[PDB]
């Protein structure tokens, strides 16, 4: 495996926070990138109480990322699979995961990064960067299934990237994935057909994208605050959807609306989202997006 890194090359410096299956640490890696003696990285681990299923997805995420190359998708750098504990080494995203970043921007935050909340132009930029990454993932024929602010990361120039694929599934042959058995699911981010039949598609992923825009405009507030999971589950399957957070730009509200169409066939594709926003983005976008790349044919 050319992704295998020798353990001594990795030093864990500190905890960055809890991830999908375990504590994520900031580490220092010696000679892992040709031309650079030392690199700051993010190292993922799995908690001791992780179940079989969880352990399986943790490892799966490392395996699938090996095949990704997209500016808006967190990059895998390597794996320490020899001996325990297993370590998944990834590029370090300076501002952490989108949810935490968003919350630290609240006026009442205690860990404020000395920066104000996202402007409309920033919100749109983030939207397009996330849609682009998702468009890329969909082109590779994978359904994400767990799109949420917590699974997105923020770089030093605030670029947002998809960085957690703990529930991703292959859809090459059918374009969808059906949940056979049981298991814990993120109910507040799920589309009605997913809550009902356990069916997941790029379209149910579009539903999630809309909730992420909601998280952005509310600074990572809990979706459907005031309702229990059971109520949410029933509310969404019966045609209900999230309300607009105060001060949420009207233009972003129009995006959410189209992501929350009850019929999945009525929802836009990620490529449509990007196409819709293409004339209101940073000059560097066409240089790095999957949308403008030759691979998008």
């Amino acid at each position: 495996d050319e992704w295998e890194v020798s353990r001594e090359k990795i030093t864990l410096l500190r905890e960055l926070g809890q991830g999908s299956f375990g504590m994520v640490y900031e580490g220092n890696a010696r000679d892992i990138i040709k031309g650079e003696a030392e690199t700051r990285v993010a190292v993922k681990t799995v908690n001791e109480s992780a179940s079989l299923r969880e352990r399986i997805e943790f490892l799966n995420e490392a395996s699938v990322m090996k095949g990704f190359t997209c500016h808006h998708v967190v990059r895998l750098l390597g794996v320490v699979s020899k001996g325990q504990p297993t370590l998944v080494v990834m590029e370090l995203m300076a501002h952490g995961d989108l949810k935490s970043y968003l919350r630290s921007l609240r006026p009442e935050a205690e860990n404020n990064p000395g920066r104000p909340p996202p402007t409309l132009q920033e919100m749109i930029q983030m939207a397009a960067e996330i849609a682009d990454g998702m468009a890329y993932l969909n082109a590779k024929k994978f359904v994400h299934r767990d799109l949420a602010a917590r699974n997105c990361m923020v770089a030093h120039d605030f670029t947002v990237k998809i960085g957690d694929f703990g529930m991703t599934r292959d859809i090459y042959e059918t374009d969808y994935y059906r949940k056979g058995g049981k298991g814990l699911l993120p109910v507040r981010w799920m589309a009605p057909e997913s809550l009902k039949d356990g069916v997941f598609t790029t379209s149910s992923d579009m539903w999630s994208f809309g909730v992420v825009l909601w998280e952005i405009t509310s600074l990572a507030e809990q979706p459907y605050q005031g309702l229990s999971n059971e109520q949410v589950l029933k509310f969404v399957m019966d045609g209900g959807y999230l309300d607009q957070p105060d001060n949420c730009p009207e233009r972003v509200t129009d995006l959410m609306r189209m992501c929350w169409q009850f019929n999945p066939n009525m929802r836009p594709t990620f490529l449509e989202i990007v196409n819709l926003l293409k004339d209101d983005l940073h000059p560097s976008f066409p240089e790095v997006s999957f949308f403008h790349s030759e691979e998008n044919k």
Binding site: E36, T39, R40, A94, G114, H156, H282, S284, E287, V288
Partner: protein, 278 residues
């Protein structure tokens, strides 16, 4: 001062505003020669031209024009030549300039993987290049490909005099047009390698820096290097005013630094690099 200024701009979210003022206060000088009808095919972009007072003049009778500017920073004691990525028909001119200005190094910042630049250097040791129009020969002597940058050793020969010179070519490959580097560390790592190579030495002519337009990424690279030099030459490093250093550089070439994000990155890189050279 510098670092507190940075935090002050971040807190009020004024980068666009600060960057805007810089554009408004920037020098406006004549570009008569670059706009001549016979020079249109020598410019990659209509809106990016070298000022007449600081443009590099080719030492030839035919046409002495090339889209390149000499940025001479008196206080930092360093000169730089910023130019556009050569076009297929200006590759000979590009090397004539490198030769006439006695440059020892070239810094290229075009993003790899369809460049907005012509292939002006040999792809293989055995396939040297000859520029008939300027009577020059270029041979790749060695190439070391790293993760985000490549360092090439080239031998340039003036065929008219048969004199030879070694040129070091440094290519940062992960910097998107109108964008910023993947990280301040990789950026600084590249900068330091270029400095260590001796290519930025005063005994040599100005280092040639380019990407596509030769103002955005090219300007960030030069602004950062210059600010670190200035800090090294003062008792108090935090007193350096990045905004003023940029306006000074803009007296020699228009539009240095194309986005407020590049301006912010420069501050980041200069602040992080300073804490490294100290």
């Amino acid at each position: 001062e510098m670092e507190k200024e940075f935090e002050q701009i971040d807190k009020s979210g004024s980068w666009a505003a600060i960057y805007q003022d810089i554009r408004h206060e920037a020098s406006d000088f004549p570009c008569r020669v670059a706009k001549l009808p016979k020079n249109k095919n020598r410019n990659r972009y209509r809106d990016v031209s070298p000022f007449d007072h600081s443009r590099i003049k080719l030492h030839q009778e035919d046409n002495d024009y090339i889209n390149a500017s000499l940025i001479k920073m008196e206080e930092a004691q360093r000169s730089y030549i910023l130019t556009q990525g050569p076009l297929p028909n200006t590759c000979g001119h590009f090397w004539e300039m490198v030769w006439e200005q006695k440059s020892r190094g070239v810094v290229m910042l075009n993003r790899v993987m369809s460049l907005k630049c012509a292939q002006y250097w040999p792809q293989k040791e055995e396939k040297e290049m000859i520029f008939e129009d300027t009577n020059l020969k270029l041979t790749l002597i060695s190439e070391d490909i790293k993760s985000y940058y490549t360092v090439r050793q080239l031998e340039l020969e003036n065929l008219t005099t048969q004199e030879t010179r070694e040129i070091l070519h440094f290519h940062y490959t992960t910097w998107p047009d109108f964008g910023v580097p993947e990280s301040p560390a990789s950026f600084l790592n590249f900068l330091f390698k270029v400095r260590e190579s001796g290519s930025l030495s005063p005994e040599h002519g100005p280092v040639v820096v380019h990407a596509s337009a030769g103002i955005g990424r090219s300007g960030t690279f030069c602004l950062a290097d210059t600010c670190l030099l200035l800090m090294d030459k003062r008792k108090d490093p935090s007193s350096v005013d990045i905004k003023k250093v940029l306006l000074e550089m803009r007296k020699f070439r228009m539009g240095l630094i194309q986005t407020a994000d590049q301006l912010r990155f420069s501050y980041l890189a200069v602040i992080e690099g300073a804490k490294f050279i100290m």
